[PDB]
């Protein structure tokens with residue numbers, strides 16, 4: 001067992017064209033190991049592929065972190081007449097998250113091969129890659145790559161000479177963050193408003209077009225071929241137990257070199273920021289708070305960031321979450337209340353409006369936060385806002401409602417003196 | 432949608448003339464039972480009460496909504512008309 | 519900003535719209551991507567194709583999409599008003615979209631927005647009198663490590679300063695088309711001042727491949 005994690009070697013990185021300095025097209029992809037022995041992987045069978053993903057300990061990289069091997073095994077059942085589909089979530093809408101964008105445009109063939117291998121394990125006839133409409137150039141890059149795979153016989157009829165037919169369609173979104181939610185993504189593909197479905201049924205039983213479906217994040221799908229080639233045991237050698245593998249991180253905000261970088265799971269938060277992002281603007285002592293996994297995760301203050309690790313279990317114990325592993329850094333010159341208030345404004349603009357607690361509650365929370373920014377409120381409203389957030393959390397159809405409540409809870413948990421100070425200043429200036 | 436007003440049996444009497452009061456236009460009546468409504472646990476209790484008081488009566492059997500088969504999943508059927516075009 | 523339609527002389531059911539013969543060929547490819555019996559799945563791509571041909575979506579374009587795909591017009595209206603990339607009113611030739619969500623705000627997207635307004639002489643939500651530019655704020659565009667950034671039509675312009683965006687607008691006025699991507703010195707999402715990873719040449723086919731395959 002390892003005590004410490006990080007310092008991932010280049011030989012062990014999966015996304016080796018992360019920065020687009022090598023040819024992203026098929027020839028460059030093959031020279032880097034993509035599409036190698038895909039036929040042999042396919043001829044191993046869905047159970048062997050699903051075993052490798054289970055052994056790798058891989059968990060969903062879209063934000064929720066479900067164990068990928070178990071989730072994909074819901075599809076490993078006899079057909080009943082309906083087709084079966086893999087839906088790749090390339091909506092990438094969480095603020096702070098831009099990792100999936102670099103996979104699609106610089107390593108498109110990893111994603112295409114992942115669809116074939118991942119789709120084979122589920123017995124899917126095709127993959128629908130849902131990419132946010134704003135990613136037009138990335139969508140075109142992916143479409144060029146898919147045409148190359150088709151022309152080379154790597155997908156389509158008799159993919160990789162394996163006797164398995166598989167198509168890969170790209171469908172673009174039209175501007176909605178809620179379409180990253182797995183059931184709302186399915187609804188969007190079907191030509192409706194992106195409004196999430198209740199569960200049950202679950203997608204593996206009733207999904208896109210009403211057929212058995214699996215929705216998977218781009219990063220989850222793109223690492224599957226490598227896991228099969230190099231083995232699950234290789235992947236599980238990275239990170240803590242139940243926190244396996246490498247991870248793409250986005251470090252943005254008040255850092256010297258905001259960047260995307262691949263790094264081992266369970267790396268300390270401080271080492272990640274200082275080693276790869278060039279440190280906090282103005283020095284580590286200038287740090288105020290970090291949102292560790294995209295806007296939906298509660299912020300943690302500087303004291304927590306001193307020692308916390310970046311994996312699913314460590315961040316849960318710190319009262320937050322890994323999320324998409326989008327690290328947003330705020331230095332001490334930040335107006336923390338405004339920064340969080342802007343995130344609630346984001347959720348207010350993205351709420352699909354379907355269900356009452358988020359249609360009405362998020363808009364309500366948005367109004368209170370705007371007053372809290374100016375201090376035009378009473379301290380008794382802080383506890384009220386906490387209770388409103390708890391009335392949204394766990395009572396909505398989808399997790400966007402949970403995602404709007406958690407950032408508010410993070411602000412109140414760690415920066416209540418700041419909120420009260422703003423109110424006290426306003427009362428004097430307006431006495 | 433509340434069903435709490437459909438639990439008990441009622442006994443009411445036939446409606447009779449109401450006319451306009453010449454002075455004010457108020458609704459006048461000469462029917463002393465115009466407002467009488469009695470409540471019973473069962474129709475047997477209601478019938479027994481009516482019989483001993485000499486009233487002729489009509490009994491209407493209780494209408495109970497039949498059990499419906501509901502399935503949220505049917506809203507997304509692959510090949511059935513139950514698929515909904517909007518949510 | 520409204521979500522009800524009022525017929526005007528320039529936007530009514532009789533406003534001319536029809537897909538060009540080439541666009542009808544592209545529609546067949548779109549519709550063929552979906553299982554038979556589920557043509558409605560083509561509403562989003564086809565509705566966006568109408569905007570690409572026309573620039574925006576008059577009510578007559580929305581009606582034409584409904585007719586082609588045999589879906590009730592209301593269901594096209596619902597999609598048109600739900601997704602924010604659809605323009606139900608005309609937009610300038612260059613739709614400037616500035617991200618102002620917290621990660622871009624933390625890196626001074628306000629300066630970018632103020633620089634644009636000062637140069638173009640317009641406020642957010644407005645179109646220039648020449649009808650060349652329209653300006654709006656948008657939520658996260660998925661390029662947060664490259665903040666602050668804007669999207670002009672289909673392209674991203676990244677790591678902007680007030681000087682960079684003003685140069686991009688000057689090129690657009692001149693009729694040139696600026697190259698997308700970071701304007702700071704780097705090429706994409708790599709850390710500035712030197713790669714901290716992927717410095718070594720990547721391994722070739724078969725590296726680390728487990729035994730048994």
Ligand SMILES: Cc1cc2nc3c(=O)[nH]c(=O)nc-3n(C[C@H](O)[C@H](O)[C@H](O)COP(=O)(O)O)c2cc1C
Pocket residue numbers: 059060061062063064065066071089090091092093094177178179180181182183215216217218220221398399400403
């Ligand atoms: C509001 C909202 C937005 C989401 N956006 C994304 C997204 O952009 N990309 C993504 O992979 N998952 C997103 N998710 C999570 C998905 O619903 C789902 O958990 C994920 O796609 C499953 O893939 P995975 O198991 O491989 O992680 C979002 C969820 C919510 C509630």
Ligand code: SF4
Pocket residue numbers: 178195196350351352353354355356358359396397398399400401402
């Ligand atoms: S929580 Fe919000 S986004 Fe999710 S279904 Fe309810 S209203 Fe829609």
Ligand code: FES
Pocket residue numbers: 095096097617618619620621622623657658659660661662665667
């Ligand atoms: S916050 Fe602006 S691109 Fe993400």
